[PDB]
Design a protein around this ligand. Sequence first.
Ligand SMILES: Nc1nc2c(ncn2[C@@H]2O[C@H](COP(=O)(O)OP(=O)(O)OP(=O)(O)O)[C@@H](O)[C@H]2O)c(=O)[nH]1
Ligand SMILES: Nc1nc2c(ncn2[C@@H]2O[C@H](COP(=O)(O)OP(=O)(O)O)[C@@H](O)[C@H]2O)c(=O)[nH]1
Ligand SMILES: [Mg+2]
Lengths: 432, 166, 73, 50, 37, 431
Amino acid sequence: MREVISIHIGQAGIQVGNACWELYCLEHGIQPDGQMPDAFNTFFSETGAGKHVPRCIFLDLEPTVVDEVRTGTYRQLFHPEQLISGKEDAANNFARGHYTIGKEIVDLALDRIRKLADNCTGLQGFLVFNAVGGGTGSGLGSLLLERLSVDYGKKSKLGFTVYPSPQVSTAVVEPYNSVLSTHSLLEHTDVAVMLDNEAIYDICRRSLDIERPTYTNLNRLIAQVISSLTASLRFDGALNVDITEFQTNLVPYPRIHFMLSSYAPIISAEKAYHEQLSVAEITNAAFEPASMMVKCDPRHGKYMACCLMYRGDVVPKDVNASVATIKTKRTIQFVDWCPTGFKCGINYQPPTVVPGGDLAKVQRAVCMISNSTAIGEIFSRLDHKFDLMYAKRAFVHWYVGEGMEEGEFSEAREDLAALEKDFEEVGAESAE
Amino acid sequence: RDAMLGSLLGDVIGGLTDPNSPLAEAEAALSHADKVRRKKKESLHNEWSTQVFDTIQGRLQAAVDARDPAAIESRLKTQYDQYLHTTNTKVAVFRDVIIEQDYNPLAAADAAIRVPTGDIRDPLKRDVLKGEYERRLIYGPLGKETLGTQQWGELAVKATPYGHCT
Amino acid sequence: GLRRELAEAKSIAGRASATWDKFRKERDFHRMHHKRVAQEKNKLLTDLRRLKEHYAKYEPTILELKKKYETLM
Amino acid sequence: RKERDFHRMHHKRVAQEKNKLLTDLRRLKEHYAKYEPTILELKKKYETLM
Amino acid sequence: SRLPVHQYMTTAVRTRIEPLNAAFTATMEARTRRLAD
Amino acid sequence: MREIVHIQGGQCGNQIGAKFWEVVSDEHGIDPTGTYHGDSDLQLERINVYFNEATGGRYVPRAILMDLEPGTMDSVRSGPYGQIFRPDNFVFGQTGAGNNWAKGHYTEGAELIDSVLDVVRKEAESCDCLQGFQVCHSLGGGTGSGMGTLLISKIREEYPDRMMLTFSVVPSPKVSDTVVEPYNATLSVHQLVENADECMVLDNEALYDICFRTLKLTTPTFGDLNHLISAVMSGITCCLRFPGQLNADLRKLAVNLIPFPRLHFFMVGFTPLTSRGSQQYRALTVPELTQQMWDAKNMMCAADPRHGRYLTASALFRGRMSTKEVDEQMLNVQNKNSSYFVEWIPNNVKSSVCDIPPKGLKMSATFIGNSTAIQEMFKRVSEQFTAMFRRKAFLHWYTGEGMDEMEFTEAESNMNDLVSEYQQYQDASAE
Ligand SMILES: Nc1nc2c(ncn2[C@@H]2O[C@H](COP(=O)(O)OP(=O)(O)OP(=O)(O)O)[C@@H](O)[C@H]2O)c(=O)[nH]1
Ligand SMILES: Nc1nc2c(ncn2[C@@H]2O[C@H](COP(=O)(O)OP(=O)(O)O)[C@@H](O)[C@H]2O)c(=O)[nH]1
Ligand SMILES: [Mg+2]
């Protein structure tokens, strides 16, 4: 059977983890207590066979965000053995999360993973939810990702990361924590999907006309993106895209695995009635840059490979018409060596709506994850951002004191510059 | 009966080891054919590699060798700064409209590495391309005339003469 | 314009002259091998007949050993 | 070119039927090779009974 | 003096397939031999 | 005493095969439960071609459902006419190829070929005199292509004196559902030229065109695409299931239509396809069917018969008709198109007549065409292969399971001698 273990590391992972596991429960009819609604039914309740514990791990060194889940509305859903806290947070330090403080917690994390791997019959992949801006999401994220490659082989490791914005920051040491974690994301992930914080802010400002977006609103439509791509495993459809189908069609080379994301219909409740949501209409909106979840230009790069997860009442006819309209337009540019670049996946289940959510009930939805050479555009912003700070060697005595050597900064810079050269190398076109 | 049994056993046993046996002749023919096809397979792989892949990657890696990383980060910094300036000034940026004076995102696609790939003659396409070689000294527009795939959607399916009033 | 037509005709004659030299060599390449494989084809035909005669000896031999083994038993 | 294509067509056709008799030779080879362990075992059995 | 992208196998892909683990190490010794020669 | 073993490969094969057993079981009178309910004795006479005997008068099809995922077999089991199939024939994998050719061929297809070959060998030894092996799959997949072509290799080794029919759905240039789709097709056709005796070639863009140009369906799903493919498969076996004036079984169609062993790829098309709005206006006659049959928009192949030359054609007419009108109509289309038919084959089109029409149509015709013109579809797959293979794009996924990049050269080379031979026999002339 298909089955996926998703690990959530850091505060940003578990706030998404609170949002995504809220959406999974409403999709399958699971109540927050965990019970799906003759004498066997009385036997069914007391044996716990109607309880559905998630295949998830909430680990974070900071206790004040994980106990909120422990005392929240989903206290009965999660096993208390699956929620891992810590004495002291990594606190915006990749050295603390990877060497000193994250060392004594990751061994307890693989113990929880081994218990979750024993319950599953045949495992298919791993999902990592973290932010490289913070200490725990980057540091403990890299440590957990490094150990999971050793203990488990042939099992995919899908990476969901929240990279820092070029303009928006909640901290100062994002360039250090992002660059060091990126070297782990080159090496140990299988497919990495980019998420940008203020790109969702511009989505909620424009598409959902909310002038006051907070982290609860951003994580809600983040939870739209995660469930949409894995929706082929939950429900049947005309064209299924498994978690191994995702890798074999979307990454051309092992280094090239960082990917963008997009969700096409993002319409408020009032705006929904006047808008005609057609397959051809939203597919044009899917490739629109302001509807993308990463602040980047699709026109800057060339789409090496792309996938389309369609949900709802979508026939295979008009989605193929939407394929051709994208290819014939001059603004959207493909790379020359990939003529057939689109993977089409259709699920028959319409997308669920969370109660009190800003997203409206939409019949048909598109989730667009594409591999582009304009993701090194994002890296080049963080490249000189890290290089300007490291030139004067500020914020280094925190990393040096906590076990890390000085040469780790140059090695992660060396790996990141190799990927910068990589995207120009593969972004080359052969023209006679 | 005994003499016939001896003769039959003699020939069916000596055929397994005799170098002049028809079994030995068939084994020699099969081994010769297997060696010939293995050598032809290896020769085809090596000649395709040396004539196409080595040349194309030599040109591409030479172009990347000539290219310098620092100029690449400077150019992508300028491009990203232009994009953030446009998103800061304008009330959202939309893909369909392009103001050339304001913002030219196609310059990024224009400033890309170019590899000639005109001198290369593909060894795998020898029999297919011999005809166009001898006519002269990718293929042409091929397929049958069909409906435009832009018209396959639910909107133009009523505008096209097929299914106009159905 | 008369000089251009003469240059085109000399180019056509020159380009053709190189090619039909290659056509004569290639057609000689095909005739020699086609006759060679055809002689080799007839060898496999005689080899196939001999091996079928050799294989025809096998199934009586299995039967005859079964007959002799029972009589010896 | 017409004279070349006539011999090109004939050379390919004999080359194809060369491999067809080759595979027919291999199929008959595998069939009677399975008879070989049986005829060897009965011959060893016949010698021991003698 | 970098490895081409179609030859560089990352560790996540490498730990999946032991035939491809040996494929990358065959390329690694090819790099050291070519530079020494 | 003739029978055909049917094999379904992958999601495309299971979906098309479900709709093929929808038609022939309804044509022969099998209910959903599997019992006979036909009112004509001719239906009951020849059911051993596609069905096996069972207790209580049941008839199970000679179908082997194989794939690598449990997802698309839950659909065919839950669908209509899904209970007639034998659960012993429900062989499946669990990991799934994920549209990778060699994952279903080398590293995971090897663990399932031993299971699927036991079921085929058990079903082939049970019946008496085999006619051929019919398989329906797609070339661009990884589940039905990589595993399916290896079964084509295996059953040809131990059944070399039997016919073999492949109804393979090729990739389309205009519409694409997989990124690595040209890799799967190039390696599949390389395995199909030597093993498969003859191939029926189908393309989704041609099926999408005929579903809207002719049938005027504004919303074509996969259901009505597979229905047209289902009608073709029942058209080929019209000789075996029912008597007729002229009988041409699977062997006779193969020997008439295949002049040379490599030139065995075909283009097909069902003739009487009209929309219901224009159903009552059109008059069904033998000259009316022949005009529609030779039209390019009635073709279920993406190749253009206008651009090429017809090496051999065959039309299987079903229904009560005069054979004199058939011989006049085929001679009419050969004379009026002399540069469209091949010159060195006199009597280019050989046809057969069966007196039993299908359900709902008084007259019907099934067209099989060996045209040289099929090189263009293989060229379009070859264009996308050299776009990707010359840059080693998406190739590290293929070389993991032991089949290295060295094994791609002969696949494209054997993708090229086929289209060179088709090009050579087109230009070649008499004398
Ligand atoms: N999308 C999203 N991003 C968040 C959220 N919360 C925090 N982030 C991102 O995470 C960054 C803050 O650092 P974190 O990764 O949360 O740090 P942490 O997880 O608390 O780990 P430590 O700093 O070691 O305690 C911010 O810059 C945000 O971009 C959230 O709820 N949703
Ligand atoms: N005619 C038809 N074609 C289909 C159907 N389902 C999939 N296909 C074709 O098969 C291709 C994808 O093959 P895929 O489903 O991945 O094959 P698999 O690997 O065996 O599952 C697409 O290009 C479709 O055109 C179907 O129900 N009918
Ligand atoms: Mg924290």
